[PDB]
Design a protein around this ligand. Structure first.
Ligand SMILES: *[C@@H]1O[C@H](CO)[C@@H](O[C@@H]2O[C@H](CO)[C@@H](O[C@@H]3O[C@H](CO[C@H]4O[C@H](CO)[C@@H](O)[C@H](O[C@H]5O[C@H](CO)[C@@H](O)[C@H](O)[C@@H]5O[C@H]5O[C@H](CO)[C@@H](O)[C@H](O)[C@@H]5O)[C@@H]4O)[C@@H](O)[C@H](O[C@H]4O[C@H](CO)[C@@H](O)[C@H](O)[C@@H]4O[C@H]4O[C@H](CO)[C@@H](O)[C@H](O)[C@@H]4O)[C@@H]3O)[C@H](O)[C@H]2NC(C)=O)[C@H](O)[C@H]1NC(C)=O
Ligand SMILES: O=C(OCc1ccc(OC(F)(F)F)cc1)N1C[C@@H]2CN(C(=O)c3ccc4[nH]c(=O)oc4n3)C[C@H]2C1
Ligand SMILES: [Ca+2]
Ligand SMILES: [Ca+2]
Ligand SMILES: [Cl-]
Ligand code: NA
Ligand code: NA
Ligand SMILES: [Zn+2]
Length: 805
């Protein structure tokens, strides 16, 4: 019940919300059906429209009008946004030359520059160039302020996950909003776009910017607007709030626009009907900026123009139906559309088997337009697994397509020409970022970045300390004139040992053999120096990685590579090597095919053994430094050390061998040398964080050798590719991957063909940021460069996406 029989007299768009069953006058009361009787009358005035006209100038104040052109309006803070243009001979903001804002020029009483977030739904990144002619206000913001060519949303590229990621800096798996539609098994409840359940606080985790602000004594405007409050009224409300007394005035504000998303669903991303929505968005920006200029706040306020996701061409005749694949289609529930999520219709059914469902959806039709995954097998870059609201079975759907359960669900629900929600690497899903104001830079282009990073910058822009989040604080310092946050490198927790020769061959009983019993005063001083670290400046270009947890490990030096060997996990955490442009690929000699050699620096008891692999019929083994890339026949022996060995499924060895034999050399040619850091990853609980020893679910049969869930590589070179990787004077260039360690290649439908037809495609799919690898290993890379830490942070957040221009 709401006793709706009070009043909004003098309370229009109040900032503090009152407690039921009292009647409300806040910008959300409509969406709760709880506004006072007179709300429409007093708070949503529309009389006479939104603009001043030549004959409204200096009129008698009539309180019934939407906005005012009277003389006293500037003091009351409620003029139509164009009042000065029409009645005082002033110019529109857009028609002024832009001048650098070197310092905040604010009215007395302002303790900090205010922040206005102008967010636009479905604003595809390419609209900035393609609609440039019809968006003059937005185009002035872009070219005078700081801008990116695009900004990467989170997966799934839906509305609520992306808006709440903007507000919190969290992956949807961590903030809880994992889709536009959700079921929570612990709650036994569903979350929909329509309805009242979405208004319950229990869905929304993390700490959004407005709460972070309130708790630290910064006042916030209310971010959410009811759908029936027109755009023009939202702008006037923000402007009115900005006229309040210093003690009452918020410092952070939000505007939301349903366009162009709303139209893009109907007409598609570039439908001719799309020009008008872009014109109107630009008109609304113009109004805000004209309003700010009237109050002399246009060189004081920081404005962020930001989208949640883009928009793709999608029609009904591009729908795949599960009913064309499954027999038992009635025992399942599907969350449909641009992504697929499958669970059992009833948990009282013990005959339901996810394994057989996946099998029935795997490579069944030659042109198939979705791919099924157990959630833990999704590319790690999506960070989409660690939440009870994310179903075990997931369908990644091809751009331009839909997935539905039965055909009946599509025609008894063509209505639409556009949609979104696909993989966040897809070009048509990219969205926009522009920052404009005293704290942003002047006329600056920055590289593309991810939307998880903004929460930190907004906190910076407001002088707040950010709640723990997924951004990397300092990685967007290059956007800002000042207010920068100065990050330090995490302290190393474990220091390494540097073992020498401590064990005799015969102390080892590992069941390993090698054909290496052959025989010089010159060439023996040489091999000693290599094991002491003479070539280490060649293979360890950026310092050794830091270990940021408590453990026991050894640094091992070799002619061609260096590794940090973990005595706990019985394998290296990392292996580092440089492959120059001129280097040569050789093969493994016939006598050395099954050669594994004891490492006399490491005790038998901290070594793997060959017997375990022989006994394990499923598991085989591979090497981290590839024998193929040894610099000499003699150095090749180092590659067969038991300490370079890691466990690998035969099916995965096909992938690994192609990468090591073909691709590394190809990258060295194209990039003028590469440095490579490879290693194992253990993430059995799929939380995206390094597993402790007691979390490993799988060992090589009859031993304490743990099985990695993934294998990573970080491939670095010089951004100026005229300089070789090992003699680089400037910025670096990186690409990385995290390949799932799987006993089959079911993920690749073309895997019965030659590795050259499918391997590289798979690697591209599982591209990663160095930062993703750091979470998963508890390491910290690039500790010794000549670059600034901020720049290195940007590098660590980079993702190579493999999309075209
Ligand atoms: C992205 O950034 C985020 C944020 O920084 C990272 O997530 C953090 O990771 C931490 C490590 O996993 C985690 O710390 C744990 O906190 C537990 C208490 O957490 C509560 O309080 C916080 C802070 O206010 C709050 O945010 C949490 O809210 C969660 O839960 C509610 C509902 O339950 C949700 O509404 C909300 O969305 C959020 O859920 C998300 O996180 C949880 C995990 O906390 C997931 O399960 C969800 O799927 C979802 O993603 C909480 O209300 C605390 O209990 C933990 O402590 C245990 O572990 C430590 C290890 O040191 C041990 O010493 C303790 O003894 C304790 O173990 C005991 O409990 C065990 C389990 O019951 C039991 O096995 C043992 O026997 C012990 O009894 C732990 O410290 C932190 O909560 C989250 N924060 C957030 C916001 O998600 C994330 O890692 C980043 N991602 C990447 C890739 O880097
Ligand atoms: O006022 C709203 O949001 C303010 C807001 C602004 C910025 C924020 O973040 C930042 F400031 F920190 F940056 C956070 C919040 N709302 C009301 C709208 C109801 N919606 C749909 O119903 C919808 C809209 C488009 C859709 N497309 C689709 O497929 O489903 C959709 N549902 C979308 C909701 C957004
Ligand atoms: Ca949207
Ligand atoms: Ca883990
Ligand atoms: Cl969804
Ligand atoms: Na085997
Ligand atoms: Na296959
Ligand atoms: Zn939409």
């Amino acid at each position: 019940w709401t006793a709706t029989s009070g009043s909004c007299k003098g309370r229009c768009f109040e900032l503090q919300e009152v407690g039921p069953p009292d009647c409300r006058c806040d910008n959300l009361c409509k969406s709760y059906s709880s506004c006072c009787h007179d709300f429409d009358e007093l708070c949503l005035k529309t009389a006479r429209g939104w603009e001043c006209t030549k004959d409204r100038c200096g009129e008698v104040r009539n309180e019934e009008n939407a906005c005012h052109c009277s003389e006293d309006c500037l003091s009351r803070g409620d003029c139509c946004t164009n009042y000065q243009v029409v009645c005082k001979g002033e110019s529109h903001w857009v028609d002024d030359d832009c001048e650098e804002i070197k310092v905040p020029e604010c009215p007395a009483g302002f303790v900090r520059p205010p922040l206005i977030i102008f967010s636009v739904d479905g604003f595809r990144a390419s609209y900035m160039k393609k609609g440039s002619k019809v968006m003059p206000n937005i185009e002035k913001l872009r070219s005078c302020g700081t801008h990116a060519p695009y900004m990467r949303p989170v997966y799934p590229t839906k509305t609520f996950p992306n808006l709440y990621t903007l507000a919190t800096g969290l992956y949807p798996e961590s903030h809880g909003i994992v889709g536009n539609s959700m079921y929570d098994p612990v709650f036994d409840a569903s979350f929909h776009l329509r309805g009242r359940e979405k208004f319950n606080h229990r869905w929304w985790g993390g700490q959004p910017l407005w709460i972070t602000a309130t708790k630290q004594g910064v006042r916030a405007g209310t971010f959410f607007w009811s759908v029936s409050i027109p755009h023009e009224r939202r702008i006037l409300t923000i402007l009115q709030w900005l006229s309040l007394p210093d003690n009452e005035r918020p410092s952070v504000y939000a505007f939301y626009s349903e366009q162009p998303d709303f139209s893009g669903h109907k007409y598609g991303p570039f439908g001719p009907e799309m020009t008008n929505p872009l014109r109107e968005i630009d008109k609304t920006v113009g109004q805000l900026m004209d309003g700010l200029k009237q109050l002399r706040l246009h060189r004081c306020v920081n404005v962020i123009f930001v989208g949640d996701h883009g928009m793709e061409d999608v029609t009904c005749d591009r729908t795949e139906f599960l009913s064309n694949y499954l027999t038992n289609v009635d025992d399942i529930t599907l969350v449909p559309g641009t992504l697929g999520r499958i669970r059992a219709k009833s948990i009282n059914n013990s005959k339901y088997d996810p394994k057989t469902i996946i099998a029935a959806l795997t490579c069944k039709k030659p042109d198939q337009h979705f791919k099924p995954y157990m959630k833990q097998h999704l590319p790690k870059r999506l960070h989409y697994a660690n939440n009870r609201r994310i179903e075990d079975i997931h369908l990644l759907v091809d751009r331009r397509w839909h997935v539905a359960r039965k055909p009946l669900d599509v025609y008894k629900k063509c209505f639409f020409q556009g949609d979104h929600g696909f993989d966040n690497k897809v070009n048509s899903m990219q969205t926009v970022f522009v920052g404009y104001g005293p704290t942003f830079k002047y006329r600056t282009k920055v590289p593309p970045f991810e939307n998880i990073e903004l929460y930190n910058v907004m906190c910076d822009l407001l002088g707040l300390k950010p709640a723990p989040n997924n951004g990397t604080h300092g990685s967007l310092n290059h956007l800002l004139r000042t207010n920068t946050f100065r990050p330090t490198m995490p302290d190393e927790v474990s220091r390494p040992n540097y073992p020498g020769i401590m064990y005799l061959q015969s102390e080892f009983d590992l069941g390993c053999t090698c054909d290496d019993k052959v025989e010089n005063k010159l060439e023996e001083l040489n091999k000693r120096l290599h094991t002491k670290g003479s070539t280490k400046e060649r293979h360890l270009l950026y310092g050794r990685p830091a270990v940021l947890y408590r453990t026991s490990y050894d640094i091992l030096y070799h002619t061609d590579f260096e590794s940090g060997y973990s005595e706990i996990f019985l394998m290296p955490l990392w292996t580092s090597y440089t492959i120059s442009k001129q280097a040569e690929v050789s093969s493994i000699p016939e006598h050395l095919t099954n050669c594994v050699r004891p490492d006399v620096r490491v005790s038998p008891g901290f070594s793997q053994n060959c017997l375990a692999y022989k006994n394990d019929k499923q598991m085989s083994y591979g090497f981290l430094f590839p024998p193929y890339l040894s610099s000499s026949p003699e150095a090749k022996y180092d590659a067969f050390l038991v300490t370079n060995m890691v466990p690998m499924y035969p099916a995965f060895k096909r992938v690994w061998a192609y990468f090591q034999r073909v691709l590394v050399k190809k990258y060295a040619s194209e990039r003028n040398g590469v440095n490579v850091i490879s290693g194992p990853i253990f993430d059995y609980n799929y939380d995206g964080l390094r597993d402790t020893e007691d979390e490993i679910k799988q060992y090589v049969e009859g031993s304490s050798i743990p099985v990695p869930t993934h294998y990573y590589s970080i491939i670095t070179s010089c951004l100026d590719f005229t300089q070789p990787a090992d003699k680089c004077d400037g910025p670096l260039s990186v690409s990385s991957f995290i390949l799932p360690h799987r006993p089959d290649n079911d993920e690749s439908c073309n895997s019965s063909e030659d590795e050259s037809k499918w391997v590289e495609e798979l690697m591209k799919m599982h591209t990663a940021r160095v930062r993703d690898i750091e979470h998963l290993t508890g390491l910290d890379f690039y500790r010794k460069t000549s670059r600034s830490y901020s720049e290195i942070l940007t590098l660590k957040t980079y993702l190579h996406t493999y999309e075209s221009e």
